[PDB]
Enzyme design. Structure first.
Site, PDB file in Angstrom:
ATOM      1  N   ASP A   1     141.577  95.179  29.102  1.00  0.00           N
ATOM      2  CA  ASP A   1     141.709  93.846  28.540  1.00  0.00           C
ATOM      3  C   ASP A   1     140.691  93.617  27.431  1.00  0.00           C
ATOM      4  O   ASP A   1     139.533  93.310  27.702  1.00  0.00           O
ATOM      5  CB  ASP A   1     141.490  92.810  29.642  1.00  0.00           C
ATOM      6  CG  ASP A   1     141.653  91.389  29.147  1.00  0.00           C
ATOM      7  OD1 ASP A   1     142.158  91.217  28.020  1.00  0.00           O
ATOM      8  OD2 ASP A   1     141.295  90.457  29.905  1.00  0.00           O
TER       9      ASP A   1
ATOM     10  N   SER B   1     144.437  87.442  10.070  1.00  0.00           N
ATOM     11  CA  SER B   1     145.631  87.981   9.449  1.00  0.00           C
ATOM     12  C   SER B   1     145.875  87.283   8.120  1.00  0.00           C
ATOM     13  O   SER B   1     145.569  86.104   7.952  1.00  0.00           O
ATOM     14  CB  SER B   1     146.823  87.794  10.392  1.00  0.00           C
ATOM     15  OG  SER B   1     148.051  88.121   9.778  1.00  0.00           O
TER      16      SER B   1
END
Length: 330
Positions: free
Chosen positions: A35, A199
């Site tokens: 994770d 992004s």
């Protein structure tokens, strides 16, 4: 040193991925959920409340000659999906794919929430976010990666998740045969303890690319792609009959649909998520309403590039002094 371990989807939907991990002496192999959005290595154990164990393999520290109680240390964690676990702490030897760390904090669960109990395939979590998020008190502990880092050939790990197929976690090297083209690296902020990056935009299907900054985290422990409501609405508007259902808890679409791809930007590079990756199947067995793999982050407080996005790429988690993230197509 290096390590290399195969990671395998837990079910037919790629809801999560499990990777075998050797703990203790002699080795006890547990299948852990790696994770990159948390920083605790915790396991089902001989200390876990018996009614909360249903099929998991447990770690038994009393059977390990290298286990030592970390006296006074406790831990307690809550995840973004509302699940939780807590307990005490041992140090022991932990190996992943041939890479061994001695003195790793292994957090033994005394209690786990229902979602963990109900998932018999996951024997615990191995956190790979920054150690500043580790929940052990009163002495915070380091992640497996942090402990391994100095011994690694290069201070990196890579995630190469499969679509309906096994993939690979590598530590300490970049497998140049595992991706196509070049890797594009992008800056990381560690301010919130995550692999947080920005992004450069998105496209829906064959549509034009929208240049826009989207701050989010690379999180292998989250199944879906969670993005701003504007972006998600633009995506689902291209699917006839798709709608957000408060009763179901997100966007659903007719199972008869063909889903468009979704592209996200990494610098000037583009990662394309095929439409099929966005189909999470019937909302309940036999239903003709299907659950979408792109969902709104509104009310999470953070955008999350979960498995839906990451499995479309070869992803480098560069833990050098100035951390960065790399993405390549594959």
């Amino acid at each position: 040193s290096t390590g290399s371990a195969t990671t395998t989807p837990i079910d037919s939907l790629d809801d999560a991925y499990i990777t075998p991990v050797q703990i203790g002496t002699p080795a006890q192999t547990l299948n852990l959920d790696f994770d990159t959005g948390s920083s605790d290595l915790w396991v089902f154990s001989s200390e876990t409340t018996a009614s909360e164990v249903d099929g998991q393999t447990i770690y038994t520290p009393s059977k390990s000659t290298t286990a030592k109680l970390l006296s006074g240390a406790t831990w307690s964690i809550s995840y973004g999906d509302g699940s939780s676990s807590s307990g005490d702490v041992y140090t022991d030897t932990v190996s992943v794919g041939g890479l061994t760390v001695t003195g790793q904090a292994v957090e033994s669960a005394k209690k786990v929430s229902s979602s963990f109990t109900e998932d018999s395939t996951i024997d615990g979590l191995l956190g790979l976010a920054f150690s500043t998020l580790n929940t052990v008190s009163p002495t915070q502990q380091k992640t497996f990666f942090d402990n391994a880092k100095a011994s690694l050939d290069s201070p990196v790990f890579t995630a190469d998740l499969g679509y309906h197929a096994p993939g690979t976690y590598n530590f300490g090297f970049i497998d140049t045969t595992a991706y196509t083209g070049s890797i594009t690296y992008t800056a990381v902020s560690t301010k919130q303890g995550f692999w947080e990056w920005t992004s450069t935009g998105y496209a829906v299907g064959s549509g034009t690319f929208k240049s826009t900054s989207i701050d989010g985290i690379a999180d292998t422990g989250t199944t879906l792609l969670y993005l701003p409501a504007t972006v998600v609405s633009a995506y689902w508007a291209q699917v006839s009959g798709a709608k957000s259902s408060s009763s179901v808890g997100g966007y659903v679409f007719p199972c008869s649909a063909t889903l468009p791809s979704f592209t996200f930007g990494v610098g000037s590079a583009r990662i394309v998520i095929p439409g099929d990756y966005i189909d999470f199947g019937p909302i309940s067995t036999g239903s003709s309403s299907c659950f979408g793999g792109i969902q709104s982050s509104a009310g999470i407080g953070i955008n999350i590039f979960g498995d839906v996005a990451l499995k479309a790429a070869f992803v480098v988690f560069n833990g050098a002094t100035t951390p960065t993230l790399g993405f390549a197509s594959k």
